[PDB]
Each structure stands twice: as C-alpha cells, then as structure tokens.
Swiss-Prot record, chain A:
Domain of life from the UniProt record: Bacteria
Shown residues within the full chain: 29 to 120 of 122
Gene: dgkA
Induction: Expression is activated by the two-component system BasRS. Repressed by sigma-E factor.
pH dependence: Optimum pH is 6.3-8.3.
Catalytic activity: a 1,2-diacyl-sn-glycerol + ATP = a 1,2-diacyl-sn-glycero-3-phosphate + ADP + H(+); 1,2-di-(9Z-octadecenoyl)-sn-glycerol + ATP = 1,2-di-(9Z-octadecenoyl)-sn-glycero-3-phosphate + ADP + H(+)
Entry protein name: Diacylglycerol kinase
Transmembrane parts of this sequence: 4-20, 24-41, 68-91
Reported regulation of activity: Requires a lipid activator for activity. Activation is observed with cardiolipin and a large number of phospholipids, sulfolipids, neutral lipids, fatty acids, alkylglycosides or detergents. A lipid cofactor-induced conformational change may occur as part of the activation process. Requires a second divalent cation in addition to Mg(2+)-ATP. Inhibited by the tetraphosphate-linked ATP-DAG bisubstrate analog.
Membrane topology of this protein: Multi-pass membrane protein
Swiss-Prot record, chain C:
Subcellular localization: Cell inner membrane
Protein name as catalogued: Diacylglycerol kinase
Record note on what altering G77P does: Loss of activity
Gene this chain is encoded by: dgkA
The organism's taxonomic lineage, starting at the top: Bacteria, Pseudomonadati, Pseudomonadota, Gammaproteobacteria, Enterobacterales
Quaternary data: Homotrimer.
Cofactor note: Mn(2+), Zn(2+), Cd(2+) and Co(2+) support activity to lesser extents.
Catalytic center residues: E63
Amino acid sequence: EAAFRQEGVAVLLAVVIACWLDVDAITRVLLISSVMLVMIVEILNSAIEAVVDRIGSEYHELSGRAKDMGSAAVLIAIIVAVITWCILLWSH
Amino acid sequence: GFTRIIKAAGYSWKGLRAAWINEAAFRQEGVAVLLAVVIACWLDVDAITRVLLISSVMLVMIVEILNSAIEAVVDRIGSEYHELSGRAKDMGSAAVLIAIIVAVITWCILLWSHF
Amino acid sequence: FTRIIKAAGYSWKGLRAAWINEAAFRQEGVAVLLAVVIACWLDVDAITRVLLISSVMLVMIVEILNSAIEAVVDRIGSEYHELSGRAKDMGSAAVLIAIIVAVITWCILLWSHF
C-alpha cells in the first residue's frame, strides 16, 4: 500500500525522532504510543476497507459511510498525534 | 502527492459528518468529549496530565467512530442477507464501554493524585 | 435514562459473547487483568499507573474490535470463498501492534522507575 508507507514512514520517523531527543521516559512513551495509536487505527481501517471490498459491488450510503467513517477515525487519531506532540514539545 | 491527502481529508469530513448526522448516540459522546476536553483545559495541571485526560477522552472518540463504521457494515449485510447475528454491534458497543471505563478510571486516578 | 442501560446490556451480552464464543479471548483477558493488578501492586507515579493500565486496555479494546471484525467475516464467508482473509489478518496485525506498545511502554516505564 502506497499511503500506508506514507504513514508508515511518518510513524517510524516520528518514533525515531522521539527517541533521538532526550526526553522524560513517560513523554517518549506518550509520543510513541500516540503515533502508534494512529498506526493501529490505520490497520483497522485497512481491515474495514477489506470487508467493504469483499461484499457488494454498488455504492451505498451503507457501504460508503463505512469507509468514510474509517477515514474519519484515522483523522482523529492523527489529530491526537499532532496535538499531543504540540503540547508535550511546548512543555519542554 | 499532496492531492491524495486533501481527498482523504474530504472523505474524513463527509464521513465524520455522516457519523454526526446519521447517529444520535454519537452526539452524547460528542458533547461529553468536547466538554471533558475543555474542562481538562481550564483546570490547572501538568502538561502530561492534560495530555492524558484528553487522550483518554479521544480514545473513547476514536473507538466510537470505529463502532459507527462496523454498524454501517452490518447495515449493508442486513440489506443483503436476511437474518442478523447482531454479535458484531454488541462487541463494538462493548469496546466503546471499555474505552469509557478507561476514561472514568483515568480521570479518577489523575484527579485524585492532583486533588 | 434507559437508552443507556440497554447499551450496557448489549455491552454485557457482547462481552459474554466475546468471552465464551472465542476460546482465545480468555488468554489476553488473563494477561490484561494480571498486568493491571500487578501495575496496581507496584507503587508508582499515578500518571505511570495510568499509562501501564492504558497500554494494557488499549490492547483490550483492539482485541474486542478484532472479535467484531471476525464476526462480520463469519456472517459473510459462511459458504463463500474469500479474497478477504486479509481483513482478519489486518485485525490480528492491529492486535499485535497494540501488544508491542504494551511491551515497549512497560519496558521504558519500568526502566525509568528502576
């Protein structure tokens, strides 16, 4: 997957970066586990899109709403990543 | 390259708002979540703890959206097939419940620590 | 308020379902309750107790979601050959990532404290 390697890249980079920076163990944990929250959610979204692909041919509100919601969940996870990193790095 | 990102954002918006309008059980949690966040922001506390209360709340949020996705799928199957197990929606609901339990407990312990 | 108590009932039946139907759910259950109790035995910074437990419960929630996905795949591929075993595989992968997070979190935190 193309974009899963885009966020894969974003996640591994974010992790490595969060490790190079000397930071409180708790805070390294928070950064890492935040970006990993994003990771897990994305894999779940992959699973959903897999099931939506398995069943049905046509567009439905029922069928599109699902994938749309998955994408939304991913977006929320990333918002959490952004905000978490923001507040923690601001705390300094 | 950058177009894909904005398309994803768009789908995210249409799906988040689909989640909002097509469900009235997602708004109780919406209110509870935004309120919990705001409240967690006007109280004085260390940044790490802000991060924690808020992220517990948002864990609940994300899980809820996923549950919405599952129920959409089951709606799709229930259209095609005739009988529904209903074991999927139940477990989604269970996941949400666990997330909220985490919220409650997290807030409990943190607020006990500080106060 | 009953519109909430019905949801609680559904959570309970769906959890007795997740528990009993999956003969494997119980394992991660043991690991998680043990991890929680142990993390409560240890005298730690409230924040850190919260984090340990949060990692563990993250694993829990992800696991339940995976059970949900598995149920869906069951209803579908009852008699049908599937190009969607990858769905369940992704689920299992998500669980694995959650547990990796648990392991790493506990590692770093206990290293810090000790």
